[PDB]
Motif scaffolding. Sequence first.
Motif, PDB file in Angstrom:
ATOM      1  N   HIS D  50      40.362   8.099 -12.652  1.00 24.23           N
ATOM      2  CA  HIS D  50      41.518   7.574 -13.372  1.00 24.23           C
ATOM      3  C   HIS D  50      42.174   8.690 -14.164  1.00 24.23           C
ATOM      4  CE1 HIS D  50      44.152   5.747 -16.206  1.00 24.23           C
ATOM      5  NE2 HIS D  50      43.806   4.508 -15.916  1.00 24.23           N
ATOM      6  N   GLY D  51      43.501   8.759 -14.084  1.00 20.09           N
ATOM      7  CA  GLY D  51      44.228   9.803 -14.778  1.00 20.09           C
ATOM      8  C   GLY D  51      44.323  11.017 -13.871  1.00 20.09           C
ATOM      9  N   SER D  52      43.559  10.991 -12.778  1.00 16.25           N
ATOM     10  CA  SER D  52      43.541  12.081 -11.800  1.00 16.25           C
ATOM     11  C   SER D  52      44.977  12.508 -11.495  1.00 16.25           C
ATOM     12  CB  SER D  52      42.837  11.620 -10.512  1.00 16.25           C
ATOM     13  OG  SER D  52      42.694  12.662  -9.567  1.00 16.25           O
ATOM     14  N   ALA D  53      45.335  13.712 -11.927  1.00 15.25           N
ATOM     15  CA  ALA D  53      46.674  14.231 -11.713  1.00 15.25           C
ATOM     16  C   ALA D  53      47.010  14.249 -10.233  1.00 15.25           C
ATOM     17  CB  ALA D  53      46.784  15.622 -12.286  1.00 15.25           C
ATOM     18  N   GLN D  54      45.998  14.481  -9.399  1.00 11.32           N
ATOM     19  CA  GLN D  54      46.174  14.517  -7.939  1.00 11.32           C
ATOM     20  C   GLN D  54      46.660  13.165  -7.420  1.00 11.32           C
ATOM     21  OE1 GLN D  54      42.040  15.896  -7.017  1.00 11.32           O
ATOM     22  NE2 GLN D  54      43.010  17.544  -5.822  1.00 11.32           N
ATOM     23  N   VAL D  55      46.147  12.098  -8.025  1.00 16.24           N
ATOM     24  CA  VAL D  55      46.491  10.735  -7.655  1.00 16.24           C
ATOM     25  C   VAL D  55      47.793  10.304  -8.299  1.00 16.24           C
ATOM     26  CG1 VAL D  55      45.801   8.332  -7.855  1.00 16.24           C
ATOM     27  CG2 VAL D  55      44.115  10.127  -7.328  1.00 16.24           C
ATOM     28  N   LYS D  56      48.065  10.838  -9.477  1.00 10.93           N
ATOM     29  CA  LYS D  56      49.283  10.503 -10.172  1.00 10.93           C
ATOM     30  C   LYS D  56      50.382  11.282  -9.471  1.00 10.93           C
ATOM     31  CE  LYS D  56      52.360  11.944 -13.523  1.00 10.93           C
ATOM     32  NZ  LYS D  56      53.050  13.268 -13.641  1.00 10.93           N
ATOM     33  N   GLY D  57      50.125  12.562  -9.242  1.00 13.54           N
ATOM     34  CA  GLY D  57      51.108  13.383  -8.568  1.00 13.54           C
ATOM     35  C   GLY D  57      51.414  12.852  -7.182  1.00 13.54           C
ATOM     36  N   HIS D  58      50.419  12.229  -6.559  1.00 13.72           N
ATOM     37  CA  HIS D  58      50.597  11.692  -5.218  1.00 13.72           C
ATOM     38  C   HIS D  58      51.192  10.298  -5.293  1.00 13.72           C
ATOM     39  CE1 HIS D  58      49.956  12.035  -0.925  1.00 13.72           C
ATOM     40  NE2 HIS D  58      49.451  10.816  -0.894  1.00 13.72           N
ATOM     41  N   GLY D  59      50.918   9.605  -6.394  1.00 17.64           N
ATOM     42  CA  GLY D  59      51.444   8.262  -6.578  1.00 17.64           C
ATOM     43  C   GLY D  59      52.934   8.404  -6.773  1.00 17.64           C
ATOM     44  N   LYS D  60      53.366   9.656  -6.775  1.00 15.66           N
ATOM     45  CA  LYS D  60      54.759   9.993  -6.934  1.00 15.66           C
ATOM     46  C   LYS D  60      55.301  10.239  -5.536  1.00 15.66           C
ATOM     47  CE  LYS D  60      57.572  13.555  -9.250  1.00 15.66           C
ATOM     48  NZ  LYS D  60      57.862  14.250  -7.952  1.00 15.66           N
ATOM     49  N   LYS D  61      54.520  10.916  -4.708  1.00 12.60           N
ATOM     50  CA  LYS D  61      54.956  11.189  -3.341  1.00 12.60           C
ATOM     51  C   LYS D  61      55.210   9.911  -2.522  1.00 12.60           C
ATOM     52  CE  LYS D  61      52.692  15.767  -2.747  1.00 12.60           C
ATOM     53  NZ  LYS D  61      51.877  16.577  -1.788  1.00 12.60           N
ATOM     54  N   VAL D  62      54.377   8.883  -2.698  1.00 10.28           N
ATOM     55  CA  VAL D  62      54.565   7.626  -1.970  1.00 10.28           C
ATOM     56  C   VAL D  62      55.807   6.907  -2.506  1.00 10.28           C
ATOM     57  CG1 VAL D  62      52.100   7.264  -1.555  1.00 10.28           C
ATOM     58  CG2 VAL D  62      53.153   6.339  -3.597  1.00 10.28           C
ATOM     59  N   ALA D  63      55.942   6.879  -3.830  1.00 14.76           N
ATOM     60  CA  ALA D  63      57.072   6.213  -4.471  1.00 14.76           C
ATOM     61  C   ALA D  63      58.387   6.749  -3.949  1.00 14.76           C
ATOM     62  CB  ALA D  63      57.005   6.387  -5.976  1.00 14.76           C
ATOM     63  N   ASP D  64      58.501   8.073  -3.889  1.00 10.80           N
ATOM     64  CA  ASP D  64      59.725   8.688  -3.392  1.00 10.80           C
ATOM     65  C   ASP D  64      59.924   8.256  -1.944  1.00 10.80           C
ATOM     66  OD1 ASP D  64      60.547  10.247  -5.699  1.00 10.80           O
ATOM     67  OD2 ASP D  64      58.794  11.519  -5.310  1.00 10.80           O
ATOM     68  N   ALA D  65      58.874   8.412  -1.150  1.00 11.44           N
ATOM     69  CA  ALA D  65      58.921   8.022   0.245  1.00 11.44           C
ATOM     70  C   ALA D  65      59.496   6.610   0.371  1.00 11.44           C
ATOM     71  CB  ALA D  65      57.526   8.078   0.834  1.00 11.44           C
ATOM     72  N   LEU D  66      58.943   5.670  -0.387  1.00  8.58           N
ATOM     73  CA  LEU D  66      59.402   4.292  -0.318  1.00  8.58           C
ATOM     74  C   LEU D  66      60.866   4.180  -0.698  1.00  8.58           C
ATOM     75  CD1 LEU D  66      56.311   2.437  -1.727  1.00  8.58           C
ATOM     76  CD2 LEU D  66      57.237   2.258   0.551  1.00  8.58           C
ATOM     77  N   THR D  67      61.272   4.975  -1.681  1.00  8.77           N
ATOM     78  CA  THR D  67      62.658   4.961  -2.130  1.00  8.77           C
ATOM     79  C   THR D  67      63.541   5.384  -0.972  1.00  8.77           C
ATOM     80  OG1 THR D  67      62.113   5.513  -4.409  1.00  8.77           O
ATOM     81  CG2 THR D  67      64.342   6.043  -3.622  1.00  8.77           C
ATOM     82  N   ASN D  68      63.098   6.418  -0.280  1.00  8.63           N
ATOM     83  CA  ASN D  68      63.844   6.916   0.851  1.00  8.63           C
ATOM     84  C   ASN D  68      63.887   5.818   1.895  1.00  8.63           C
ATOM     85  OD1 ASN D  68      64.069   8.248   3.630  1.00  8.63           O
ATOM     86  ND2 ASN D  68      64.560   9.963   2.257  1.00  8.63           N
ATOM     87  N   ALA D  69      62.848   4.995   1.911  1.00  4.85           N
ATOM     88  CA  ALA D  69      62.785   3.899   2.859  1.00  4.85           C
ATOM     89  C   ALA D  69      63.897   2.905   2.545  1.00  4.85           C
ATOM     90  CB  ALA D  69      61.426   3.212   2.787  1.00  4.85           C
ATOM     91  N   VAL D  70      64.048   2.566   1.259  1.00  4.31           N
ATOM     92  CA  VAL D  70      65.080   1.619   0.824  1.00  4.31           C
ATOM     93  C   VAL D  70      66.457   2.172   1.170  1.00  4.31           C
ATOM     94  CG1 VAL D  70      66.231   0.546  -1.135  1.00  4.31           C
ATOM     95  CG2 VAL D  70      63.765   0.501  -1.049  1.00  4.31           C
ATOM     96  N   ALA D  71      66.671   3.460   0.915  1.00  4.77           N
ATOM     97  CA  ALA D  71      67.959   4.066   1.233  1.00  4.77           C
ATOM     98  C   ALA D  71      68.342   3.763   2.679  1.00  4.77           C
ATOM     99  CB  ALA D  71      67.909   5.571   1.015  1.00  4.77           C
ATOM    100  N   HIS D  72      67.394   3.949   3.594  1.00  2.00           N
ATOM    101  CA  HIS D  72      67.648   3.724   5.015  1.00  2.00           C
ATOM    102  C   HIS D  72      66.992   2.480   5.614  1.00  2.00           C
ATOM    103  CE1 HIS D  72      68.842   7.833   4.347  1.00  2.00           C
ATOM    104  NE2 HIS D  72      67.590   8.178   4.108  1.00  2.00           N
ATOM    105  N   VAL D  73      66.955   1.380   4.867  1.00  2.00           N
ATOM    106  CA  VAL D  73      66.350   0.153   5.386  1.00  2.00           C
ATOM    107  C   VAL D  73      66.985  -0.191   6.710  1.00  2.00           C
ATOM    108  CG1 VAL D  73      68.061  -1.304   4.270  1.00  2.00           C
ATOM    109  CG2 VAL D  73      65.895  -2.293   5.043  1.00  2.00           C
ATOM    110  N   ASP D  74      68.276   0.106   6.820  1.00  2.00           N
ATOM    111  CA  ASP D  74      69.028  -0.172   8.035  1.00  2.00           C
ATOM    112  C   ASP D  74      68.488   0.638   9.216  1.00  2.00           C
ATOM    113  OD1 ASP D  74      71.391   2.329   7.496  1.00  2.00           O
ATOM    114  OD2 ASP D  74      70.669   1.289   5.713  1.00  2.00           O
ATOM    115  N   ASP D  75      67.727   1.689   8.923  1.00  2.00           N
ATOM    116  CA  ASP D  75      67.159   2.554   9.958  1.00  2.00           C
ATOM    117  C   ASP D  75      65.891   3.253   9.482  1.00  2.00           C
ATOM    118  OD1 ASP D  75      68.138   5.852  11.134  1.00  2.00           O
ATOM    119  OD2 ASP D  75      66.492   4.562  11.791  1.00  2.00           O
ATOM    120  N   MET D  76      64.805   2.505   9.366  1.00  2.00           N
ATOM    121  CA  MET D  76      63.547   3.081   8.905  1.00  2.00           C
ATOM    122  C   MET D  76      62.784   3.971   9.895  1.00  2.00           C
ATOM    123  SD  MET D  76      61.154   0.736   6.553  1.00  2.00           S
ATOM    124  CE  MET D  76      62.282  -0.552   6.130  1.00  2.00           C
TER     125      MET D  76
END
Lengths: 146, 146, 141, 141
Positions: D50-76
């Motif tokens: 818990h607090g693992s920067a690696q997991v927090k830093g990565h919990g950021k990589k997925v979030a962005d990815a998902l955001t990019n997903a929303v941007a292109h929902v029309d073409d995932m």
Amino acid sequence: VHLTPEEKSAVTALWGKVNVDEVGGEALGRLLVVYPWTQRFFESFGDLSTPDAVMGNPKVKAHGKKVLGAFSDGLAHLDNLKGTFATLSELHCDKLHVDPENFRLLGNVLVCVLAHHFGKEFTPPVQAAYQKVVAGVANALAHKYH
Amino acid sequence: VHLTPEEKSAVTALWGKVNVDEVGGEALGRLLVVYPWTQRFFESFGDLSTPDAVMGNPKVKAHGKKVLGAFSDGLAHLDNLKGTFATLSELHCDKLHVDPENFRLLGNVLVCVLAHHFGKEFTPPVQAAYQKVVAGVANALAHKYH
Amino acid sequence: VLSPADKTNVKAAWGKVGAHAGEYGAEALERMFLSFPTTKTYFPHFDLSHGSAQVKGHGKKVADALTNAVAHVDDMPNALSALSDLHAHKLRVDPVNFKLLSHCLLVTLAAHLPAEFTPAVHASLDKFLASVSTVLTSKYR
Amino acid sequence: VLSPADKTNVKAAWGKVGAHAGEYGAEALERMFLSFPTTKTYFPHFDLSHGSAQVKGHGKKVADALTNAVAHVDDMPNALSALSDLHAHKLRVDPVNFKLLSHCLLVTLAAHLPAEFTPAVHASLDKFLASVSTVLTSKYR
Ligand code: HEM
Ligand code: HEM
Ligand code: HEM
Ligand code: HEM
């Protein structure tokens, strides 16, 4: 079906604050709303074409607490869900023919409902403690299948 | 019983004519070849990039018979699949980290291997008789993940 | 969008089945209905009897469908969108079931395509039927 | 592609999350590793404490990815194809696991968006993350 000393506390302490009339139907309603194909089994309930019509439906709440009661009947038989849900299994398996997968589906919905309600007090560990209980009830309720 | 009187016959009779050294490694091979992500757990076996390299692989055949040995061990004791694979379930859970869904996945591959071999003698009913045993072993092998 | 290899293999195996297409399709269903009864809930009337013309003639409808899928094996979304709505909506077929039939189709093809049904092929097919399932359930998305 | 409604609800929900997206992502991961330990095996090097920067830093990589997903929902399929190859091929992530994170993401959103997480939203989100997981496993096909 395995809950450590502190896992059991979180569970049965949380279950204490659970509005035994609310959660029940909100999980069955959300199940009906999120995984629509489940509506097939509850057509004698009425019009479920709108989330609102589903959630508010008198039947969905009536049988919703009936189910939440079977989940409570589980946290009181954590060691032998095997038999606690035996007949409840033949009903769903032999009579209603609900595919076992959905038992697990409903379970997670319940966990969402909980996470929904208790907000933060529903920490990752406690969620994990619950994931275990649903994991068992679902299995125990599928007994007449495997 | 778990299986009816005639279900048992088909099962224990079909299991009679199994090349207890073949089936085993062909099921585990195909499991690795058809559902690639399963390879993650057997990297110490070698290069598994080509079907040929997987099927012929000596380790896949050695442990393949070991697994087919546990399935026979289940058919022998179709009564306590839960305790008969107890430790075997902790090993897979607590040490190997295999997701239980795959136990079901491998079971169907075994069934595929059979239908493959016994051609038509593997009639729908006989298949159904096995689908049950796998259904069980798979569950039994997953009990410790709850 | 399976490898050009997987395509060759599928079309190849589908070629083998050819005439038996209808037959095998019906066997897949009977197998399914027996291995996982729950799948019978979607068939009250056809109430399946071993040899049921209902099914024999229906095991034919699925085979034709799958063939059409092979034809347009890089536009399954459009080629099948028709079946999507039917099975997704009207019928409301539990997605878990799309998996159960596929396994039954493979078992069917394994018991009838002995030396044809290699691991490579078994993969190309499970991979193909996977894309089909995906599409039929696209209507729950 | 989700219904125009589903989209509105997603981007709406994504709207609320906003800055917490990175945070939530990491919680969803910690939640996953805890409720289903077998998923940790996919993160060797990561010291998932818990607090693992690696997991927090990565919990950021997925979030962005998902955001990019929303941007292109029309073409995932195209927007994500990149993550597909990686997760499917390179990483060899068990498909059941993509369902596990999704449920964990939802639990995350429900615990942080009390009166925002309605049944309708819950459905648009579970339906969105389904498409997402459908895409990340597309490469096993
Ligand atoms: C976690 C596992 C589940 C629990 C705790 C549960 C519990 C129950 C209970 C307590 C009843 C009431 C007994 C009665 O009066 O007949 C019931 C009935 C029934 N359940 Fe479930 N159930 C589960 C999952 C599901 C799922 C996944 C479906 C399908 C989407 C489903 C469909 C039904 C139906 C159709 C009935 C009959 C309701 C009626 O008309 O009275 N249940 N269940
Ligand atoms: C449910 C059916 C299965 C049976 C009965 C079974 C049986 C066995 C047995 C008895 C062993 C211990 C002895 C040995 O290593 O040969 C074993 C080891 C192992 N099993 Fe399973 N298993 C099953 C499914 C799986 C699945 C689905 C996976 C793959 C994701 C798996 C992964 C492992 C691994 C990592 C080993 C270690 C092999 C080694 O490195 O020597 N097993 N299995
Ligand atoms: C393997 C992929 C499948 C394909 C390609 C497929 C294709 C078809 C087709 C083309 C029809 C007939 C359409 C018409 O009447 O014009 C049909 C109907 C139907 N299918 Fe499927 N199907 C598949 C899987 C499933 C699954 C897994 C189930 C689940 C048990 C299912 C249940 C049914 C039912 C209830 C009908 C209605 C029968 C009737 O009243 O005519 N299908 N399917
Ligand atoms: C909605 C689902 C998911 C999304 C959006 C997603 C997104 C991401 C992203 C953005 C990365 C970084 C990729 C890059 O470097 O370009 C990543 C890496 C990775 N993902 Fe996922 N992922 C998902 C689910 C999963 C699941 C199901 C597992 C684990 C059981 C997983 C395991 C991994 C691993 C191990 C890596 C490499 C991380 C590292 O070692 O740095 N992912 N994921």
